[PDB]
């Protein structure tokens, strides 16, 4: 709510202060490029899918030219990049599973688990609280529509409420984006365990800045982005926004 | 791996292919070679810039030096950077902050493949020009020779990409890898500037990540 060192972001929902790792990256890019900018705030949804053939949220703004630049958890995929050109992924991510702490690695083999394909036992793994109209939801629907359909009865609304249910043991696990799940596991108390493989990630992807389709500044910005990688100038920010304790 | 990717592509968008190798056996870099005025790209990237090949399909590290003139799609795979070392029970480097990594000495022989993206990154890496001098005086002409030297203890350490070095250490055993992914990067595709097919290739990359 309306703190220094934070970009004044206007919330034109149909004047807060925004600060974070991606905010710092955008500020550094602006300093290296010397370009002005506002800070459009997405309110109707978070990212938005092709709802009834119509994009909403992040894509609903940028693709329909209501917005020009785009930052955030912009997953790179064919269903998103065909209409909006995506920059180089500055950070890597994917699909992982958030599970309880070391109290009851199970026999689950990830999404390729035999129990997923054959949930005929007394207690098979299911009920992952996938967020509605989410990128990972579309990924699992496209890859395995039957798997999502079988487990469709779960706790959709919120990630944080899913974390609370996992802490209470209501849900065995929750499959979501690798980066956010990893950061929460590193930050959540009680040493909430990562999926069966600590380094195991499914359909590995990245997060890139979604400029306008055919934007001329796309090519230089990536270079400038990797200019940071040229001097490893994002190491401290990655440590700050990724490292945890338990 | 690259062969599998390229055959998958050729099956995907129905493009004929003529596969060939490079004689120099180096990635290439901006080097002001003898009887030349400025620095000229060498190796596979040099050939691609010269138009010898339509595009490069190799475990190439994404760097903006090539991106100034080479179109790069989304990385085919992701990897980092580590050091292959023969640390076995029959501390050399405890991490990126190890004083031996910071302070060069003749006890260890730090090496990388000549004309490599890691070599250029170390050259442009500040506060480690001593490491660049160590590279210049001790670089290995190839990754295979460095791996062989580390395996039989000629080379004390070999800085190399995380995925390939880890796979080699697992496959040939008798070796260990130290240092975490202190430089996260990706292996993708490289094509001529403004190549229309590269975009499709990028989508195909996602397809592989989907498939």
Tab-separated table of C-alpha atoms in Angstrom:
chain	number	residue	atom	x	y	z
A	1	UNK	CA	0.000	0.000	0.000
A	2	UNK	CA	0.986	3.599	-0.658
A	3	UNK	CA	7.968	3.053	0.876
A	4	UNK	CA	10.989	4.162	-1.140
A	5	UNK	CA	13.043	2.116	-3.628
A	6	UNK	CA	9.727	0.832	-5.024
A	7	UNK	CA	8.193	1.694	-8.389
A	8	UNK	CA	4.872	3.566	-8.069
A	9	UNK	CA	2.456	1.134	-9.725
A	10	UNK	CA	-1.065	2.306	-10.564
A	11	UNK	CA	-3.846	-0.249	-10.035
A	12	UNK	CA	-6.422	0.610	-12.707
A	13	UNK	CA	-8.844	-2.160	-11.778
A	14	UNK	CA	-12.149	-2.094	-13.651
A	15	UNK	CA	-1.299	3.965	-6.737
A	16	UNK	CA	0.398	1.211	-4.746
A	17	UNK	CA	4.158	0.628	-4.596
A	18	UNK	CA	5.589	-2.425	-6.363
A	19	UNK	CA	8.971	-3.917	-5.461
A	20	UNK	CA	10.571	-7.304	-5.994
A	21	UNK	CA	13.155	-9.364	-7.821
A	22	UNK	CA	11.500	-8.913	-11.213
A	23	UNK	CA	10.923	-5.248	-10.351
A	24	UNK	CA	14.646	-4.845	-9.666
A	25	UNK	CA	15.472	-6.631	-12.928
A	26	UNK	CA	13.151	-4.297	-14.841
A	27	UNK	CA	14.700	-1.275	-13.120
A	28	UNK	CA	18.208	-2.450	-14.027
A	29	UNK	CA	17.123	-3.008	-17.633
A	30	UNK	CA	15.611	0.485	-17.747
A	31	UNK	CA	18.827	1.984	-16.369
A	32	UNK	CA	20.878	0.109	-18.968
A	33	UNK	CA	18.484	1.241	-21.721
A	34	UNK	CA	17.330	4.646	-20.423
A	35	UNK	CA	13.660	4.157	-21.308
A	36	UNK	CA	10.622	5.536	-19.508
A	37	UNK	CA	7.711	3.299	-18.544
A	38	UNK	CA	4.571	3.144	-16.465
A	39	UNK	CA	3.703	0.051	-14.408
A	40	UNK	CA	0.432	-1.452	-15.611
A	41	UNK	CA	-1.159	-3.702	-12.987
A	42	UNK	CA	-3.094	-6.774	-14.114
A	43	UNK	CA	-6.310	-7.044	-12.100
A	44	UNK	CA	-8.827	-9.167	-14.049
A	45	UNK	CA	-7.068	-12.454	-13.410
A	46	UNK	CA	-3.380	-13.255	-13.097
A	47	UNK	CA	-2.270	-14.507	-16.530
A	48	UNK	CA	-5.443	-15.600	-18.318
A	49	UNK	CA	-5.967	-18.319	-20.921
A	50	UNK	CA	-7.902	-18.501	-24.177
A	51	UNK	CA	-11.235	-18.347	-22.336
A	52	UNK	CA	-13.801	-19.364	-24.982
A	53	UNK	CA	-11.207	-18.437	-27.591
A	54	UNK	CA	-10.644	-15.050	-25.912
A	55	UNK	CA	-7.539	-14.291	-23.867
A	56	UNK	CA	-7.863	-12.523	-20.516
A	57	UNK	CA	-5.553	-11.297	-17.776
A	58	UNK	CA	-1.930	-10.858	-18.799
A	59	UNK	CA	-2.453	-12.135	-22.345
A	60	UNK	CA	-5.818	-10.386	-22.521
A	61	UNK	CA	-3.998	-7.095	-21.978
A	62	UNK	CA	-0.785	-7.558	-23.966
A	63	UNK	CA	-2.156	-9.592	-26.885
A	64	UNK	CA	-5.150	-7.284	-27.357
A	65	UNK	CA	-2.658	-4.376	-27.176
A	66	UNK	CA	-4.172	-3.034	-23.960
A	67	UNK	CA	-0.589	-3.392	-22.698
A	68	UNK	CA	2.769	-3.397	-24.477
A	69	UNK	CA	5.369	-4.771	-22.052
A	70	UNK	CA	4.827	-7.756	-19.774
A	71	UNK	CA	6.674	-9.074	-16.721
A	72	UNK	CA	5.946	-11.777	-14.174
A	73	UNK	CA	5.425	-15.551	-14.195
A	74	UNK	CA	5.193	-15.579	-17.992
A	75	UNK	CA	5.519	-19.253	-18.859
A	76	UNK	CA	6.948	-19.932	-22.319
A	77	UNK	CA	4.844	-22.293	-24.427
A	78	UNK	CA	3.487	-22.702	-27.940
A	79	UNK	CA	-0.032	-21.743	-26.848
A	80	UNK	CA	1.304	-18.429	-25.485
A	81	UNK	CA	4.252	-17.514	-27.723
A	82	UNK	CA	2.456	-17.907	-31.067
A	83	UNK	CA	0.703	-14.553	-30.633
A	84	UNK	CA	3.090	-12.647	-28.317
A	85	UNK	CA	6.844	-12.762	-28.854
A	86	UNK	CA	8.744	-13.848	-25.740
A	87	UNK	CA	12.192	-12.622	-24.748
A	88	UNK	CA	15.002	-14.865	-23.535
A	89	UNK	CA	14.019	-16.583	-20.255
A	90	UNK	CA	15.970	-14.712	-17.590
A	91	UNK	CA	15.042	-17.353	-14.992
A	92	UNK	CA	14.336	-21.070	-15.313
A	93	UNK	CA	11.352	-22.981	-13.946
A	94	UNK	CA	9.135	-25.943	-14.764
A	95	UNK	CA	6.678	-28.320	-13.103
A	96	UNK	CA	7.398	-29.794	-9.663
A	97	UNK	CA	5.396	-31.240	-6.766
A	98	UNK	CA	4.995	-29.640	-3.336
A	99	UNK	CA	4.662	-32.413	-0.738
A	100	UNK	CA	4.698	-32.675	3.041
A	101	UNK	CA	7.882	-32.835	5.108
A	102	UNK	CA	9.758	-36.044	5.920
A	103	UNK	CA	6.804	-37.775	7.618
A	104	UNK	CA	5.035	-40.360	5.472
A	105	UNK	CA	9.722	-40.175	-0.642
A	106	UNK	CA	6.760	-42.382	-1.531
A	107	UNK	CA	6.408	-44.810	-4.450
A	108	UNK	CA	5.273	-41.976	-6.745
A	109	UNK	CA	7.356	-41.700	-9.929
A	110	UNK	CA	6.231	-38.179	-10.765
A	111	UNK	CA	3.589	-37.656	-13.421
A	112	UNK	CA	4.753	-40.942	-14.994
A	113	UNK	CA	3.832	-42.846	-11.822
A	114	UNK	CA	2.081	-46.169	-12.353
A	115	UNK	CA	-0.277	-45.252	-9.507
A	116	UNK	CA	-1.378	-42.188	-11.483
A	117	UNK	CA	-2.250	-44.359	-14.481
A	118	UNK	CA	-3.576	-47.162	-12.232
A	119	UNK	CA	-5.237	-45.566	-9.167
A	120	UNK	CA	-7.034	-48.793	-8.225
A	121	UNK	CA	-5.320	-49.220	-4.843
A	122	UNK	CA	-6.799	-48.290	-1.469
A	123	UNK	CA	-4.972	-44.936	-1.265
A	124	UNK	CA	-3.656	-43.743	-4.637
A	125	UNK	CA	-2.007	-40.317	-5.045
A	126	UNK	CA	-4.482	-37.697	-6.270
A	127	UNK	CA	-6.153	-34.430	-5.196
A	128	UNK	CA	-3.563	-31.846	-6.230
A	129	UNK	CA	-4.975	-28.365	-5.698
A	130	UNK	CA	-4.273	-26.975	-9.161
A	131	UNK	CA	-5.069	-23.274	-9.565
A	132	UNK	CA	-7.982	-22.572	-11.949
A	133	UNK	CA	-7.091	-21.133	-15.374
A	134	UNK	CA	-3.414	-21.693	-14.659
A	135	UNK	CA	-0.520	-22.475	-16.973
A	136	UNK	CA	0.272	-25.767	-15.232
A	137	UNK	CA	-3.413	-26.702	-15.410
A	138	UNK	CA	-3.320	-26.275	-19.183
A	139	UNK	CA	-0.048	-28.214	-19.339
A	140	UNK	CA	-1.452	-31.227	-17.486
A	141	UNK	CA	-4.724	-31.010	-19.426
A	142	UNK	CA	-2.867	-31.083	-22.748
A	143	UNK	CA	-0.360	-33.775	-21.767
A	144	UNK	CA	-2.737	-35.989	-19.752
A	145	UNK	CA	-6.408	-34.985	-19.980
A	146	UNK	CA	-7.471	-38.293	-18.421
A	147	UNK	CA	-5.227	-37.845	-15.379
A	148	UNK	CA	-6.593	-34.369	-14.650
A	149	UNK	CA	-10.162	-35.524	-15.320
A	150	UNK	CA	-9.878	-38.396	-12.835
A	151	UNK	CA	-8.584	-36.121	-10.054
A	152	UNK	CA	-10.673	-33.066	-11.025
A	153	UNK	CA	-12.220	-33.049	-7.526
A	154	UNK	CA	-9.632	-31.054	-5.573
A	155	UNK	CA	-9.008	-27.644	-3.968
A	156	UNK	CA	-8.668	-25.244	-6.901
A	157	UNK	CA	-8.828	-21.664	-5.508
A	158	UNK	CA	-5.534	-20.695	-3.882
A	159	UNK	CA	-1.900	-21.771	-3.618
A	160	UNK	CA	-1.576	-20.585	-0.013
A	161	UNK	CA	-4.691	-22.474	1.076
A	162	UNK	CA	-3.251	-25.546	-0.658
A	163	UNK	CA	-0.072	-25.074	1.382
A	164	UNK	CA	-2.176	-24.883	4.545
A	165	UNK	CA	-4.021	-28.080	3.595
A	166	UNK	CA	-0.699	-29.814	2.904
A	167	UNK	CA	0.562	-28.691	6.316
A	168	UNK	CA	-2.649	-30.106	7.806
A	169	UNK	CA	-2.306	-33.244	5.670
A	170	UNK	CA	-5.602	-32.687	3.855
A	171	UNK	CA	-3.891	-33.091	0.469
A	172	UNK	CA	-1.077	-35.572	-0.104
A	173	UNK	CA	0.691	-33.356	-2.651
A	174	UNK	CA	0.179	-30.512	-5.109
A	175	UNK	CA	1.758	-30.323	-8.564
A	176	UNK	CA	2.529	-26.761	-9.657
A	177	UNK	CA	5.274	-24.572	-11.111
A	178	UNK	CA	8.772	-25.657	-10.119
A	179	UNK	CA	10.147	-22.233	-9.174
A	180	UNK	CA	7.352	-21.113	-6.844
A	181	UNK	CA	7.069	-24.539	-5.204
A	182	UNK	CA	10.836	-24.660	-4.660
A	183	UNK	CA	10.888	-21.175	-3.137
A	184	UNK	CA	7.963	-21.986	-0.840
A	185	UNK	CA	9.585	-25.258	0.246
A	186	UNK	CA	12.831	-23.417	0.982
A	187	UNK	CA	10.858	-20.777	2.907
A	188	UNK	CA	8.100	-22.809	4.591
A	189	UNK	CA	8.765	-23.874	8.168
A	190	UNK	CA	9.048	-27.544	9.066
A	191	UNK	CA	11.273	-28.325	6.050
A	192	UNK	CA	8.495	-29.140	3.607
A	193	UNK	CA	10.040	-31.672	1.258
A	194	UNK	CA	10.501	-31.293	-2.490
A	195	UNK	CA	9.150	-33.980	-4.830
A	196	UNK	CA	10.712	-37.456	-5.084
A	197	UNK	CA	13.640	-35.867	-6.937
A	198	UNK	CA	15.225	-32.724	-5.536
A	199	UNK	CA	16.492	-31.789	-8.996
A	200	UNK	CA	13.606	-33.531	-10.768
A	201	UNK	CA	11.513	-31.106	-12.831
A	202	UNK	CA	8.964	-31.903	-15.539
A	203	UNK	CA	8.645	-29.966	-18.812
A	204	UNK	CA	11.405	-27.537	-17.909
A	205	UNK	CA	10.752	-24.005	-19.167
A	206	UNK	CA	11.645	-20.406	-18.354
A	207	UNK	CA	10.195	-16.986	-17.613
A	208	UNK	CA	10.731	-14.258	-20.191
A	209	UNK	CA	9.585	-10.679	-20.755
A	210	UNK	CA	6.685	-10.751	-23.227
A	211	UNK	CA	7.192	-7.754	-25.490
A	212	UNK	CA	4.907	-6.864	-28.384
A	213	UNK	CA	4.781	-9.325	-31.274
A	214	UNK	CA	7.618	-8.151	-33.503
A	215	UNK	CA	8.945	-5.557	-31.055
A	216	UNK	CA	12.220	-4.079	-32.286
A	217	UNK	CA	13.633	-3.717	-28.758
A	218	UNK	CA	13.323	-7.478	-28.174
A	219	UNK	CA	16.730	-8.323	-29.649
A	220	UNK	CA	18.789	-5.656	-27.787
A	221	UNK	CA	17.063	-6.236	-24.437
A	222	UNK	CA	17.940	-9.938	-24.431
A	223	UNK	CA	21.552	-8.980	-25.118
A	224	UNK	CA	21.415	-6.505	-22.241
A	225	UNK	CA	19.738	-9.217	-20.175
A	226	UNK	CA	22.579	-11.600	-20.921
A	227	UNK	CA	24.922	-8.674	-20.309
A	228	UNK	CA	23.982	-9.251	-16.675
A	229	UNK	CA	24.779	-12.913	-17.293
A	230	UNK	CA	27.967	-11.584	-18.869
A	231	UNK	CA	28.962	-10.216	-15.456
A	232	UNK	CA	26.781	-12.518	-13.297
A	233	UNK	CA	24.918	-9.452	-12.021
A	234	UNK	CA	21.776	-11.417	-11.059
A	235	UNK	CA	23.468	-13.863	-8.671
A	236	UNK	CA	22.778	-11.877	-5.498
A	237	UNK	CA	19.141	-11.230	-6.431
A	238	UNK	CA	18.638	-14.913	-7.241
A	239	UNK	CA	20.159	-15.840	-3.879
A	240	UNK	CA	17.935	-13.332	-2.069
A	241	UNK	CA	14.731	-14.499	-3.771
A	242	UNK	CA	15.510	-18.223	-3.919
A	243	UNK	CA	17.559	-19.303	-0.893
A	244	UNK	CA	15.739	-20.646	2.143
A	245	UNK	CA	16.379	-22.096	5.604
A	246	UNK	CA	14.049	-25.060	6.183
B	1	UNK	CA	21.351	-35.777	-28.611
B	2	UNK	CA	21.773	-33.149	-31.329
B	3	UNK	CA	21.307	-35.851	-33.969
B	4	UNK	CA	18.042	-36.908	-32.330
B	5	UNK	CA	16.860	-33.299	-32.161
B	6	UNK	CA	17.696	-32.607	-35.803
B	7	UNK	CA	16.066	-35.798	-37.088
B	8	UNK	CA	12.987	-34.966	-35.011
B	9	UNK	CA	12.920	-31.518	-36.618
B	10	UNK	CA	13.403	-32.911	-40.131
B	11	UNK	CA	10.438	-35.183	-39.443
B	12	UNK	CA	8.532	-32.200	-38.024
B	13	UNK	CA	8.724	-29.464	-40.673
B	14	UNK	CA	9.954	-31.728	-43.511
B	15	UNK	CA	13.344	-30.147	-44.204
B	16	UNK	CA	16.109	-32.077	-45.935
B	17	UNK	CA	19.510	-32.046	-44.279
B	18	UNK	CA	23.188	-32.416	-45.142
B	19	UNK	CA	25.138	-33.189	-41.963
B	20	UNK	CA	28.842	-32.384	-41.741
B	21	UNK	CA	31.446	-31.679	-39.080
B	22	UNK	CA	34.019	-28.901	-38.683
B	23	UNK	CA	37.725	-29.423	-39.317
B	24	UNK	CA	39.050	-26.954	-36.731
B	25	UNK	CA	37.321	-28.793	-33.878
B	26	UNK	CA	36.618	-25.573	-31.968
B	27	UNK	CA	33.539	-23.524	-31.151
B	28	UNK	CA	35.254	-20.278	-32.144
B	29	UNK	CA	35.665	-16.784	-30.737
B	30	UNK	CA	36.504	-13.207	-31.678
B	31	UNK	CA	40.265	-13.583	-32.118
B	32	UNK	CA	42.497	-11.073	-33.910
B	33	UNK	CA	44.349	-13.801	-35.796
B	34	UNK	CA	47.669	-13.269	-37.559
B	35	UNK	CA	47.577	-11.183	-40.749
B	36	UNK	CA	44.218	-9.743	-39.677
B	37	UNK	CA	43.072	-6.287	-38.612
B	38	UNK	CA	40.316	-7.059	-36.081
B	39	UNK	CA	38.915	-10.055	-34.209
B	40	UNK	CA	37.079	-12.588	-36.380
B	41	UNK	CA	34.675	-15.305	-35.271
B	42	UNK	CA	36.137	-18.786	-35.687
B	43	UNK	CA	34.936	-22.372	-35.521
B	44	UNK	CA	31.325	-23.372	-36.041
B	45	UNK	CA	29.993	-19.868	-35.386
B	46	UNK	CA	32.541	-18.481	-37.836
B	47	UNK	CA	31.387	-20.933	-40.501
B	48	UNK	CA	27.729	-20.106	-39.828
B	49	UNK	CA	28.467	-16.382	-40.116
B	50	UNK	CA	30.327	-17.088	-43.361
B	51	UNK	CA	27.282	-19.046	-44.542
B	52	UNK	CA	29.081	-22.389	-44.791
B	53	UNK	CA	26.203	-24.079	-42.946
B	54	UNK	CA	22.566	-23.021	-42.768
B	55	UNK	CA	22.524	-23.359	-38.972
B	56	UNK	CA	24.557	-24.847	-36.129
B	57	UNK	CA	23.202	-27.822	-34.174
B	58	UNK	CA	25.594	-28.306	-31.259
B	59	UNK	CA	25.692	-27.988	-27.456
B	60	UNK	CA	26.211	-24.240	-27.800
B	61	UNK	CA	26.051	-21.895	-24.820
B	62	UNK	CA	23.744	-18.912	-25.288
B	63	UNK	CA	25.866	-15.758	-25.247
B	64	UNK	CA	25.027	-12.290	-26.543
B	65	UNK	CA	28.353	-12.072	-28.391
B	66	UNK	CA	26.995	-14.474	-31.008
B	67	UNK	CA	23.433	-13.172	-30.596
B	68	UNK	CA	24.529	-9.863	-32.140
B	69	UNK	CA	24.545	-11.713	-35.475
B	70	UNK	CA	23.187	-15.238	-34.771
B	71	UNK	CA	19.528	-15.936	-34.053
B	72	UNK	CA	19.020	-18.143	-30.990
B	73	UNK	CA	15.762	-19.914	-30.188
B	74	UNK	CA	14.710	-21.194	-26.775
B	75	UNK	CA	17.359	-23.511	-25.282
B	76	UNK	CA	16.914	-27.188	-26.078
B	77	UNK	CA	18.177	-28.124	-22.606
B	78	UNK	CA	19.249	-26.350	-19.425
B	79	UNK	CA	22.566	-26.711	-17.616
B	80	UNK	CA	25.056	-24.840	-15.467
B	81	UNK	CA	28.776	-24.918	-14.730
B	82	UNK	CA	30.915	-27.100	-12.467
B	83	UNK	CA	34.429	-28.548	-12.224
B	84	UNK	CA	35.351	-32.139	-12.984
B	85	UNK	CA	37.978	-33.274	-10.477
B	86	UNK	CA	39.497	-36.556	-9.291
B	87	UNK	CA	38.549	-36.175	-5.620
B	88	UNK	CA	38.332	-39.745	-4.336
B	89	UNK	CA	39.336	-41.405	-1.072
B	90	UNK	CA	42.256	-43.302	-2.560
B	91	UNK	CA	40.047	-30.295	-0.166
B	92	UNK	CA	40.875	-29.174	-3.702
B	93	UNK	CA	37.853	-26.903	-4.263
B	94	UNK	CA	35.042	-26.624	-1.715
B	95	UNK	CA	33.038	-24.279	-3.939
B	96	UNK	CA	33.054	-21.088	-5.961
B	97	UNK	CA	34.484	-19.236	-2.941
B	98	UNK	CA	37.370	-21.672	-2.447
B	99	UNK	CA	40.673	-19.758	-2.097
B	100	UNK	CA	42.295	-22.109	-4.615
B	101	UNK	CA	39.681	-21.003	-7.142
B	102	UNK	CA	40.333	-17.387	-6.148
B	103	UNK	CA	44.133	-17.676	-5.926
B	104	UNK	CA	45.900	-19.365	-8.867
B	105	UNK	CA	48.814	-21.694	-8.213
B	106	UNK	CA	50.848	-24.403	-9.912
B	107	UNK	CA	49.543	-27.104	-7.551
B	108	UNK	CA	46.363	-27.327	-9.639
B	109	UNK	CA	46.020	-27.082	-13.416
B	110	UNK	CA	42.751	-25.336	-14.231
B	111	UNK	CA	41.812	-25.923	-17.865
B	112	UNK	CA	38.994	-25.371	-20.344
B	113	UNK	CA	38.488	-26.215	-24.002
B	114	UNK	CA	40.231	-23.726	-26.277
B	115	UNK	CA	37.909	-21.351	-28.156
B	116	UNK	CA	34.917	-22.008	-25.909
B	117	UNK	CA	32.090	-19.878	-24.553
B	118	UNK	CA	33.230	-20.602	-20.989
B	119	UNK	CA	36.704	-19.347	-21.906
B	120	UNK	CA	35.303	-16.069	-23.246
B	121	UNK	CA	33.072	-15.717	-20.180
B	122	UNK	CA	36.124	-16.121	-17.946
B	123	UNK	CA	37.965	-13.587	-20.111
B	124	UNK	CA	35.144	-11.089	-19.551
B	125	UNK	CA	34.774	-12.176	-15.911
B	126	UNK	CA	36.011	-9.366	-13.677
B	127	UNK	CA	38.226	-9.887	-10.610
B	128	UNK	CA	39.443	-13.177	-12.136
B	129	UNK	CA	41.983	-12.151	-14.780
B	130	UNK	CA	44.321	-14.521	-12.942
B	131	UNK	CA	41.943	-17.319	-13.929
B	132	UNK	CA	42.133	-16.073	-17.520
B	133	UNK	CA	45.935	-16.230	-17.371
B	134	UNK	CA	45.669	-19.747	-15.937
B	135	UNK	CA	43.436	-20.661	-18.879
B	136	UNK	CA	45.871	-19.139	-21.373
B	137	UNK	CA	48.816	-21.036	-19.883
B	138	UNK	CA	46.953	-24.306	-19.229
B	139	UNK	CA	43.958	-24.611	-21.591
B	140	UNK	CA	43.133	-28.072	-22.918
B	141	UNK	CA	42.702	-28.404	-26.674
B	142	UNK	CA	39.568	-30.536	-26.216
B	143	UNK	CA	37.106	-31.732	-23.604
B	144	UNK	CA	38.025	-35.390	-24.161
B	145	UNK	CA	41.719	-34.816	-23.440
B	146	UNK	CA	40.857	-32.813	-20.317
B	147	UNK	CA	38.533	-35.586	-19.125
B	148	UNK	CA	41.247	-38.184	-19.723
B	149	UNK	CA	43.825	-36.081	-17.865
B	150	UNK	CA	41.502	-35.568	-14.888
B	151	UNK	CA	40.612	-39.272	-14.851
B	152	UNK	CA	44.285	-40.278	-14.606
B	153	UNK	CA	45.296	-37.211	-12.534
B	154	UNK	CA	47.286	-35.199	-15.081
B	155	UNK	CA	44.729	-32.385	-14.788
B	156	UNK	CA	43.750	-31.378	-11.264
B	157	UNK	CA	40.559	-29.581	-12.321
B	158	UNK	CA	38.517	-29.049	-15.486
B	159	UNK	CA	35.882	-26.306	-15.515
B	160	UNK	CA	33.051	-27.474	-17.749
B	161	UNK	CA	29.297	-27.297	-18.230
B	162	UNK	CA	27.233	-28.978	-15.533
B	163	UNK	CA	25.190	-31.431	-17.600
B	164	UNK	CA	27.906	-32.791	-19.896
B	165	UNK	CA	30.560	-33.008	-17.177
B	166	UNK	CA	28.122	-34.696	-14.792
B	167	UNK	CA	27.105	-37.227	-17.445
B	168	UNK	CA	30.738	-37.981	-18.292
B	169	UNK	CA	31.643	-38.408	-14.618
B	170	UNK	CA	28.681	-40.737	-14.090
B	171	UNK	CA	29.441	-42.747	-17.237
B	172	UNK	CA	33.186	-43.234	-16.753
B	173	UNK	CA	33.089	-43.071	-12.913
B	174	UNK	CA	36.424	-42.749	-11.057
B	175	UNK	CA	35.700	-38.996	-10.994
B	176	UNK	CA	33.623	-36.411	-9.138
B	177	UNK	CA	32.114	-33.004	-9.902
B	178	UNK	CA	32.413	-29.997	-7.591
B	179	UNK	CA	30.762	-26.596	-7.540
B	180	UNK	CA	27.054	-25.945	-7.979
B	181	UNK	CA	25.347	-24.322	-10.977
B	182	UNK	CA	26.982	-20.945	-10.431
B	183	UNK	CA	26.211	-19.971	-14.058
B	184	UNK	CA	22.791	-21.209	-15.143
B	185	UNK	CA	22.434	-21.320	-18.925
B	186	UNK	CA	20.884	-23.305	-21.747
B	187	UNK	CA	21.864	-25.205	-24.869
B	188	UNK	CA	19.738	-24.118	-27.815
B	189	UNK	CA	19.953	-23.661	-31.577
B	190	UNK	CA	21.834	-21.108	-33.640
B	191	UNK	CA	20.762	-19.920	-37.085
B	192	UNK	CA	21.507	-17.056	-39.446
B	193	UNK	CA	20.175	-13.636	-38.503
B	194	UNK	CA	16.424	-13.279	-39.104
B	195	UNK	CA	16.052	-16.913	-40.155
B	196	UNK	CA	12.311	-17.567	-40.678
B	197	UNK	CA	12.543	-21.232	-39.663
B	198	UNK	CA	14.203	-20.507	-36.304
B	199	UNK	CA	10.903	-19.310	-34.828
B	200	UNK	CA	9.332	-22.630	-35.820
B	201	UNK	CA	12.338	-24.376	-34.284
B	202	UNK	CA	11.702	-22.432	-31.081
B	203	UNK	CA	8.137	-23.739	-31.066
B	204	UNK	CA	9.503	-27.206	-31.799
B	205	UNK	CA	11.755	-26.781	-28.762
B	206	UNK	CA	8.659	-26.231	-26.639
B	207	UNK	CA	7.129	-29.279	-28.317
B	208	UNK	CA	10.104	-31.307	-27.115
B	209	UNK	CA	9.585	-29.885	-23.631
B	210	UNK	CA	5.957	-30.904	-24.089
B	211	UNK	CA	6.940	-34.276	-25.558
